[PDB]
Amino acid sequence: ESTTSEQSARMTAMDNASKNASEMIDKLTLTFNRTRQAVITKELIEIISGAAAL
Amino acid sequence: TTGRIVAVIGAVVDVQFDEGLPPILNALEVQGRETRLVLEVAQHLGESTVRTIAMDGTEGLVRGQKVLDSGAPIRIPVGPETLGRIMNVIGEPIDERGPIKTKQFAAIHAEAPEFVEMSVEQEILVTGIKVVDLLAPYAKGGKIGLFGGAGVGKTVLIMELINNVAKAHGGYSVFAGVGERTREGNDLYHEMIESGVINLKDATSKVALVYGQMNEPPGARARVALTGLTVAEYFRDQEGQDVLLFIDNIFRFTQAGSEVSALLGRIPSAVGYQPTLATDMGTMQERITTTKKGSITSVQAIYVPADDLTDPAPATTFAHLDATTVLSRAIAELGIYPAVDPLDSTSRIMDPNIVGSEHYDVARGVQKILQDYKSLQDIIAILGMDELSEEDKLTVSRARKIQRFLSQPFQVAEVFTGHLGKLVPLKETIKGFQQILAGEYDHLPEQAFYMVGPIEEAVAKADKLA
Amino acid sequence: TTGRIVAVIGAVVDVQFDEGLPPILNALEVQGRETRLVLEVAQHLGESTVRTIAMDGTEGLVRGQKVLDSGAPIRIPVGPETLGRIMNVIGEPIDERGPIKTKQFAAIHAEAPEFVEMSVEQEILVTGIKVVDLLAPYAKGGKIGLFGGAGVGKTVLIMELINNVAKAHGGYSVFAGVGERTREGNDLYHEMIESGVINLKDATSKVALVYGQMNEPPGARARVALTGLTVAEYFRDQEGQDVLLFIDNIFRFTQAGSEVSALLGRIPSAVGYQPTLATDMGTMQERITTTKKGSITSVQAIYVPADDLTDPAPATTFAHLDATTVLSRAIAELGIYPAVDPLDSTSRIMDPNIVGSEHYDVARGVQKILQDYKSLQDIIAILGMDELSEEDKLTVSRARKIQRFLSQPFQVAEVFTGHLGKLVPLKETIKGFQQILAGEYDHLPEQAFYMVGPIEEAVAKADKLA
Amino acid sequence: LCGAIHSSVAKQMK
Amino acid sequence: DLEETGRVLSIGDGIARVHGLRNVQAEEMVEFSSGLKGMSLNLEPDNVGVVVFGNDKLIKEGDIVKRTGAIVDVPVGEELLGRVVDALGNAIDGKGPIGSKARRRVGLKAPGIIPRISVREPMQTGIKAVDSLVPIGRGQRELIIGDRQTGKTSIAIDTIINQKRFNDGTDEKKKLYCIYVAIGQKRSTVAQLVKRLTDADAMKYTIVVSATASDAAPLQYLAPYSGCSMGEYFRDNGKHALIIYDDLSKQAVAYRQMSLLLRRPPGREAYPGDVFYLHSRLLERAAKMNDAFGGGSLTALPVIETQAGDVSAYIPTNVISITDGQIFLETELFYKGIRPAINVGLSVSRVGSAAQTRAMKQVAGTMKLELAQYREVALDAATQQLLSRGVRLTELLKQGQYSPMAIEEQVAVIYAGVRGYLDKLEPSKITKFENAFLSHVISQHQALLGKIRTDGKISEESDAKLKEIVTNFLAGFEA
Amino acid sequence: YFRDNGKHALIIYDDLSKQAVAYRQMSLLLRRPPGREAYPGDVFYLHSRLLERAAKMNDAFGGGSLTALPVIETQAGDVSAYIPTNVISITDGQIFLETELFYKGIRPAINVGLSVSRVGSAAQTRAM
Amino acid sequence: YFRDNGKHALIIYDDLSKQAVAYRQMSLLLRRPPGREAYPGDVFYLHSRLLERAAKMNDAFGGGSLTALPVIETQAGDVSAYIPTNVISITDGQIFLETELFYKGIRPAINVGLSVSRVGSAAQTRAM
Ligand SMILES: Nc1ncnc2c1ncn2[C@@H]1O[C@H](COP(=O)(O)OP(=O)(O)NP(=O)(O)O)[C@@H](O)[C@H]1O
Ligand SMILES: Nc1ncnc2c1ncn2[C@@H]1O[C@H](COP(=O)(O)OP(=O)(O)NP(=O)(O)O)[C@@H](O)[C@H]1O
Ligand SMILES: [Mg+2]
Ligand SMILES: [Mg+2]
């Protein structure tokens, strides 16, 4: 009974954990791409402000 | 004096004067206009030309149009006669109830109270809101700040505070509408009339209203805060009274300033903001204070652009407050209201010598367990709660019960919560959290602690749940 | 009018005129040079001086060098003579096959069809390719995003598309290689020749080519899509054909737009793109539609920067897409050709109210059978394909047949595969997949549905395989 | 990492 | 005549620099030799910066520029109904001129505090999920927010089509004229949209202002305001209009392009400091007038497209802080076939409650509650009962396009669900049940429907009969 | 004045974060072009010049001293950002505090691993 | 010279990241407009004109060839930066190197998954 139960449980646990990791990967990628874009923009606007102030 | 518009760029107008150039901060009067159009002198450009900011739309203005120097900054009606009326930046009435007859007219531009005028009396202001009262108590005559992203709960929190604090208050109240929703102004006005706080007949009104909402050009939104503050100044000083000052929303002052700063010819600072952001903000917030002459308890709502608390605006406001209530979108989304962040709302009053040891200790215990839970969040995230220590499970469980017991049903929010409003006395707040900390309710289901008043209701809701 | 060069700064040349100042978008012929040097007026700087963008290198230009105003924008040879010929940005032939003598030329800049000329209904462009026509159909006069890259049959798909449109609709095709690598442009030429969609002898060529090579200045790569588009509009407007326009690749069209903007000194917007991102794209894209005389359907190869779909480039593109065609290395490797991913490729016209209820129910039905199979696959090979319920046994068998029936021999590959290409009519497609979902062909071997055309051919192969 | 196998038996066992 | 005329000094980057025009006003329209119109934006000592409302290519140094003496305004009035125009108010449907008898500045300031009153009249969208859970009132601002292809526009369109029942009726008060502003969309899409509205006979009471992807940025920018002015005519004459801004994200990009070309300091996402104000002054104009100002109203449904569901981005947060609630559409529900793809829990209506029919409160109030119970969960009989509701009720909220339901027909079907007449029914049969039950009441029980409609409430009488009807139907409802 | 007269002074600059913001405003207003993060290109020099004035004088010079405690407000606990690292690259050590530590009950919220002193035991009594 | 006279040449550009820096210096001091990373709008054109000069000539043109092996240095793995993005798109393929592979023992540190050759097999001997 033990071995069956444990494997059912483990199967369930790992299935759920990989799902949670998937969602967390998706969410992190979104954050990555927002930050990547804000960084580009922010660096560029520094360049323009400096240029324009001459 | 007589000057002529020589340049018009949105809210920024340049006026040329042949003789007698008007000093900075002086209100000029555009001629040939149906409604009064004031232009505040912002700078002297040289060549007898001054740069100004309009307090109303500049549509229809023609080059050469005549402008007169009024001889003084924008002056508004101050005094009891402002109570129950509604005015605009320039003090004119906007309630269609006729003229405002006062003896005195104050300028909306005043130097801040001097360092010798400062008060230092620390005294708790019980609001009856569990989270605030426990974790970051407000103070009488102190400065309160409600931080929040779009739609998170600022306005409902201010209206709830008005309901709890202002109602039971001996003194006058001033409400400055700053760059927000006109329709909220109409709701406020009618709500106040209905309650009787604004009596349109008797001379018993206790609230003065000042508005300059999102429908105003930048120049007006940049000065309304100064207008309602000037009204509050009088009651504070020229009456030695406990005044309450509510502003929604003070961020709109700073944002109004970025819109014109571009037109004023200044090199932009970080994030496109005006390089004078902090000094503009400072000369204004330093006037919003208690002095030895009288006390002003101010509550300011503060909008957080893109929910980014590090944005120059919100970030600069933190140093102007004695107590902060920081609202979170993620907290609101979990259904917790008010959506206060228990780990980011602080208060200078949160000292064992002021709120006492029992209160200080429970507040610190609540925050420790919330922080400890916060640490386990990541672990919970991946492997869930089963690969968790029996010890940690217990912190998680209590934390979640504390996290829900921090939520509260507001009157103003009754339609959205589906629950009757509750007001919990400080002593009961302390006890509820003490007991949960002590594991006394480790047997009740979290859900029983959600949306209730005193801990007693938590228990009663637990039985209800069977 | 003749002007004079007053400034040369890289790809930006300033030309002064005496009288008759050339309007913006006009073409200017530089005088005294080996190769033709065209300048396109971008701005009027004042003082009879115009600012232009060079379509080729500016080396050797001298201040005062004569520049003739052509009286109009860039005009290229348009008409049947363009077919099977390779053209440049400014309409010059770059195939060493002499002039491209058409009856008339046409301006690469045009306004988009007026609201009154728009087709009021959503039609479908049957391409005769099972995956596409069934699951993610092309909208007549629509924009299709070709997601793929090299090594997945992109060129074979394109060529087949051209061939099928010529035969099943009488419409010709145009290929706009925006930022074409010379090496890859030579190969695809000769490749087109091999397939036959281009012909050096007769006048049977179905494709006309416009190339904006990577060597070329920004101004040239920015305009090629317009040159190619002008070609296509000719067959739609003057011959009421249903043209097909290939843009490879839409992303290099944007980037070239950024570069020109940069050179012109315009302040960059988010992520460094040009402030006119949306307008640069809309003015080009809106030329691609269904008019009352015909339509242009555009298959646009898309490159997504950083795999970020929310990047300003791709997100601006998607506003105009009516469908996407996804080619996958995975699908390819299963030997399924074309390597079209059945569940990734999407379409807006895949709507009951547009492609009909039958088509809709069969399309979805295939999509779902495939999605279920995907789910089941986890158990199948890993956990043993044995304890599969009567229901599951059939889902897997039918799904695998359908997935195989989605492949199809292209007429273009004929020379290499030694198998007749099959252009499958929408009616045949719908019937087939409908029957396999039904269960009618649950008694034939998979291979019978592999690389066939009409469903009949599936049964035929089955019998021959036994 | 057996989900909550171990916890159940151990709790009821002691 | 440099007093009333000017000569173009320079043209490029969208702003034309005009020499002369000594007597132009700020924000006044001017005409270009080419028939192009423009707006006097910056009155500088030596020139006038003009925003060109069209292709600036049609302008050259030297071109005469004449004054109109009018502050930018647009044609207004009932003569625009059934018409498709551009941002300037010019007809583009090829149906001859507009015989407009009045004009209204595009930039008027919104009504102040005194003239307004709290929203209290239902603005029925005809979409169950919205009229029950996110009830819109007249004079309210309600954002339609979501990612691309999440059915944002669809919501707007069903609502327009729903007004036919009122507009063709007797009761004037219940009428609602519609205005659809298309900003940055494709021409094709607009042409198809007016074609669908025509077939639905909803074009007769609808005005369409169109500044599409090929139109110059200044036209896309203006469009919203011109349509708003056309909506104020109704607002201020005791009538009721509905305006749709689709979408405001594309308008903000057009204004961003204009602002960078003006070399205004780029800030968050390179947007100007006035992007908030751009939308704030506009949306403040939808309002609910009190009786002393005629009692009219203007309901606004601005559309905002989020990128990957980020409702915390700058623009999205901006509009959210202007409007009175938002309907969020999740990319994920749409894909999962849940249509409309509305996310109950995240969608709010700050003021619509007071404007929700009483017949709805009686069933929708209890429905939302039961949706909350379900939400907290998804064994144990308790939680099981809660989960049973969720699936059922969730199916009820599904609705196809182009078939806006009357309020009485919405309360009837929702009643089925919240009362329990769906619990012993297979989830997948729920939508089948709804459709058969609706037809059943619509035909064999018009009297009951009309009762609930007229009384605006479900009284004990109506409730008794309705109970009978549903039960009877269940018994006869085949698997 | 104490430092150069045989006496010992302690100075607290609370805080240098807002000082640099006032510096940015004034410099931007003087028409000097914004450098990194909109701060002037010599924000490091602004603080470096100041903080070096704190020092130990030898006996020949009176043996006086000036001890400095500059304060810097970080955002979202990022000690690695530009302004913070600028000032850290000036001073003789740092005391980094954190809200996480604070709420967990570690008060003062000193983060040991990240804080340092560049003087070490030379500034402690033998006993300590 | 070799390419055209029927011979075959191979050229290494080590590295294009630095030439791009050099050109950015001239452009910015020439007051040409700055763009992403402060590069000018013709920086892609600058490398595309150079890389297209690598070519395989047909028999009638001598049959020569010029193969180019340009080098690009990335920052912290950012192949999406401006210069890298450009040169990646101009070329026929990329040999991606990674530090993690290097120190892990894989040397040469070539990432076999990401590295590609659009020419592939067409230039590989039958036995390979
Ligand atoms: N205490 C509360 N209880 C329940 N719901 C609340 C509460 N506070 C806010 N909400 C919900 O959130 C909505 C917005 O509240 P509100 O006080 O108007 O937000 P805000 O922060 O001022 N928004 P904004 O001014 O638009 O940026 C309310 O209408 C409710 O739906
Ligand atoms: N209630 C609905 N039921 C079924 N299908 C629907 C529904 N609403 C929309 N759709 C379908 O989904 C498509 C997309 O909806 P649409 O209103 O265009 O979304 P959108 O968010 O406004 N898109 P876009 O403007 O292109 O970003 C429509 O063409 C319909 O075919
Ligand atoms: Mg608010
Ligand atoms: Mg839409």
Contact, B234 vs B104, CB < 8 A? yes
- Distance, in Å, from the CA atom of C197 to the CA atom of C212, rounded to the nearest integer, reads 21
Report helix, strand or coil for E47: strand
Ligand number nearest to the C-alpha of E329: 2
E strand or H helix at B76:
strand B75-78
Structure tokens at B374: 């916060």
Structure tokens at E249: 């994200």
Active-site option among B75, B143, B154, B221: B154
- Distance, in Å, from the CA atom of G28 to the CA atom of G41, rounded to the nearest integer, reads 12
How much distance in Å is there from the Cα of E155 to the middle of ligand 4? 9
- Architecture of the structural domain at B1-73: Beta Barrel (2.40)
Q: Which of C9, C181, C190 to mutate to test the interface with G (most CBs of G within 10 A)?
A: C181
Residue of B nearest to F33 (CA): B267
- Ion ligand 3 — residues with CB < 5 Å: B 155
- Distance, in Å, from the CA atom of B294 to the CA atom of E147, rounded to the nearest integer, reads 53
Spatial CA neighbour of C332 closest among C152, C124, C192: C152
Residue of D nearest to B384 (CA): D3
Residue identified by tokens 């034309």 is: E16
Domains (range + CATH), chain E: 1-70 (2.40.30.20), 71-356 (3.40.50.300), 357-478 (1.20.150.20)
- Distance, in Å, from the CA atom of E299 to the CA atom of E302, rounded to the nearest integer, reads 10
* Chain D contact present for A15, CB below 8 A: no
Cis peptide leading into residue B425 (ω within 30°): no
Spatial CA neighbour of C437 closest among C344, C356, C367: C367
- Distance, in Å, from the CA atom of E171 to the CA atom of E239, rounded to the nearest integer, reads 12
The β-bridge relationship of strands B38-46 and B49-54 is: antiparallel
- Distance, in Å, from the CA atom of B439 to the CA atom of B441, rounded to the nearest integer, reads 5
Maximal C-alpha separation, chain F: 55
Set of chain B residues whose Cβ sits within 8 Å of the Cβ of F37? 270
The yes-or-no answer on residue B390 being catalytic is no
**Alpha carbon distances (Å) from G121 to B10, C327, C337, C365, G112:** 65, 21, 20, 40, 16
Tell me if C1-73 shares its fold with C350-465.
no
DSSP class per residue in G115-127: -EESSGGGGS-S-
Q: Which of G28, G36, G48 to mutate to test the interface with C (most CBs of C within 10 A)?
A: G48
Neighbours of F55 (CB within 10 A): 14
Ligand number nearest to the C-alpha of E403: 2
- Distance, in Å, from the CA atom of E89 to the CA atom of E228, rounded to the nearest integer, reads 12
* Chain C contact present for A22, CB below 8 A: no
E strand or H helix at E206:
strand E206-211
- Distance, in Å, from the CA atom of B273 to the CA atom of B253, rounded to the nearest integer, reads 12
The verdict on the CB of residue E153 being under 6 Å from ligand 2 is yes
Neighbours of C29 (CB within 10 A): 16
Do A13 and B386 lie within an 8 Å CB cutoff? yes
Structure tokens at C450: 């592999």
Structure tokens at F109: 């919220």
Do E260 and C266 lie within an 8 Å CB cutoff? yes
- Distance, in Å, from the CA atom of A52 to the CA atom of B18, rounded to the nearest integer, reads 33
Do C272 and A41 lie within an 8 Å CB cutoff? yes
Ligand number nearest to the C-alpha of C348: 2
Domain B350-466 has what CATH class? Answer: mainly alpha
The β-bridge relationship of strands E64-71 and E28-32 is: antiparallel
**Alpha carbon distances (Å) from B1 to A37, B12, B21, B26, B421:** 52, 20, 8, 12, 58
- Distance, in Å, from the CA atom of E288 to the CA atom of E274, rounded to the nearest integer, reads 26
**Alpha carbon distances (Å) from C377 to B389, C340, C382:** 37, 20, 8
Contact, C380 vs C396, CB < 8 A? yes
Spatial CA neighbour of G53 closest among C364, C279, C183: C183
In E136-175, the residues whose Cβ lies within 8 Å of chain B are 139
Instruction: Ligand 1, residue B180: give the atom nearest the CA.
Output: 25
Question: Strand runs (DSSP E) across C83-224, as ranges?
Answer: 86-87, 104-107, 124-125, 138-139, 143-147, 173-180, 207-213
Set of chain D residues whose Cβ sits within 8 Å of the Cβ of A14? 1
Could you tell me which chains touch chain E, where touching means 3 or more CB pairs under 8 A? Answer: A, B, C
Q: Which residues of C are identified as catalytic?
A: 154, 180-181
- Distance, in Å, from the CA atom of E244 to the CA atom of E259, rounded to the nearest integer, reads 24
Do A20 and B272 lie within an 8 Å CB cutoff? no
User: Looking at CA atoms only, how far is residue A44 from chain F in angstroms?
Assistant: 11
Question: Strand runs (DSSP E) across C132-225, as ranges?
Answer: 138-139, 143-147, 173-180, 207-213
Spatial CA neighbour of E185 closest among E159, E150, E223: E223
Question: Strand runs (DSSP E) across B98-198, as ranges?
Answer: 104-107, 124-125, 138-139, 143-148, 173-178
The β-bridge relationship of strands C104-107 and C75-78 is: antiparallel
Active-site option among E22, E148, E350, E358: E350
Residue of A nearest to B379 (CA): A17
Spatial CA neighbour of E153 closest among E322, E327, E338: E327
How much distance in Å is there from the Cα of E150 to the middle of ligand 2? 6
- Distance, in Å, from the CA atom of E68 to the CA atom of E37, rounded to the nearest integer, reads 10
Neighbours of B112 (CB within 10 A): 15
Number of A–G residue contacts, CB under 8 Å: 10
Set of chain A residues whose Cβ sits within 8 Å of the Cβ of E308? 30, 33
Number of B–E residue contacts, CB under 8 Å: 151
The verdict on the CB of residue E192 being under 6 Å from ligand 2 is no
The verdict on the CB of residue E401 being under 6 Å from ligand 2 is yes
Structure tokens at C126: 């049957």
The verdict on the CB of residue C308 being under 6 Å from ligand 2 is no
Domain B74-349 has what CATH class? Answer: alpha beta
Report helix, strand or coil for C326: strand
- Distance, in Å, from the CA atom of B423 to the CA atom of B403, rounded to the nearest integer, reads 18
How many Cα atoms within 13 Å fall on the side-chain side of residue G96? 18
Residue of E nearest to A33 (CA): E308
Do G38 and A40 lie within an 8 Å CB cutoff? no
- Distance, in Å, from the CA atom of G33 to the CA atom of C10, rounded to the nearest integer, reads 12
Which one-letter DSSP state was computed for residue C444? Answer: S
Do B371 and F25 lie within an 8 Å CB cutoff? no
Contact, F56 vs F3, CB < 8 A? no
Residue identified by tokens 């940025």 is: E217
- Distance, in Å, from the CA atom of B449 to the CA atom of B462, rounded to the nearest integer, reads 8
How many Cα atoms within 13 Å fall on the side-chain side of residue E236? 13
Measured by CA distance, the residue closest to atom 14 of ligand 1 is B151
Which one-letter DSSP state was computed for residue E198? Answer: H
Spatial CA neighbour of F34 closest among C329, C43, G6, B270: B270
DSSP class per residue in E319-355: HHTTSSEEEEE-HHHHHTT-SS-B-GGG-EESSGGGG
- Distance, in Å, from the CA atom of F128 to the CA atom of E224, rounded to the nearest integer, reads 73
Backbone φ and ψ of E90, nearest 5°: -70, 135
Do C271 and A40 lie within an 8 Å CB cutoff? yes
Active-site option among F49, F53, F107, F118: F118
E strand or H helix at E208:
strand E206-211
The verdict on the CB of residue E126 being under 6 Å from ligand 2 is no
- Residue count (chain E): 479
Ligand 1: which of B152, B247, B404 to mutate, judged by most atoms within 8 Å of the beta carbon? Answer: B152
Contact, C5 vs C14, CB < 8 A? yes
User: Looking at CA atoms only, how far is residue A30 from chain D in angstroms?
Assistant: 30
Residue identified by tokens 């590609």 is: G116
Residue of G nearest to A43 (CA): G37
User: Looking at CA atoms only, how far is residue A4 from chain B in angstroms?
Assistant: 18
User: How was this structure obtained?
Assistant: X-ray
Q: Find residue E42's DSSP bridge partners.
A: B9, E49
Q: Find residue E65's DSSP bridge partners.
A: E6, E32
Q: Sign (positive/negative) of CA torsion B449, B452, B455, B460?
A: negative
The yes-or-no answer on residue B461 being catalytic is no
How much distance in Å is there from the Cα of B176 to the middle of ligand 3? 13
Residue of B nearest to D4 (CA): B386
Cis peptide leading into residue B249 (ω within 30°): yes
- Architecture of the structural domain at C350-465: Orthogonal Bundle (1.10)
How much distance in Å is there from the Cα of B148 to the middle of ligand 3? 9
Q: Sign (positive/negative) of CA torsion B247, B249, B254, B255?
A: negative
* Chain F contact present for B372, CB below 8 A: yes
The β-bridge relationship of strands E325-329 and E348-349 is: antiparallel
Do A44 and C306 lie within an 8 Å CB cutoff? no
Out of E42, E112, E265, closest to residue B262 by CB: E265
3-state secondary structure F57-124: CCHHHCCCEEEEEECCCCCCCCCCCHHHHHHHCCCCEECCECHHHHHHCCCCCECCCCCEECCHHHHC
Last residue before each break in chain C (C–N > 2.5 Å): none
Residue identified by tokens 């006390």 is: B295
- Distance, in Å, from the CA atom of B154 to the CA atom of B148, rounded to the nearest integer, reads 6
The verdict on the CB of residue E400 being under 6 Å from ligand 2 is yes
- Distance, in Å, from the CA atom of E76 to the CA atom of B229, rounded to the nearest integer, reads 41
Domain ranges of chain C: 1-73, 74-349, 350-465
How many Cα atoms within 13 Å fall on the side-chain side of residue B323? 30
Contact, E79 vs E95, CB < 8 A? no
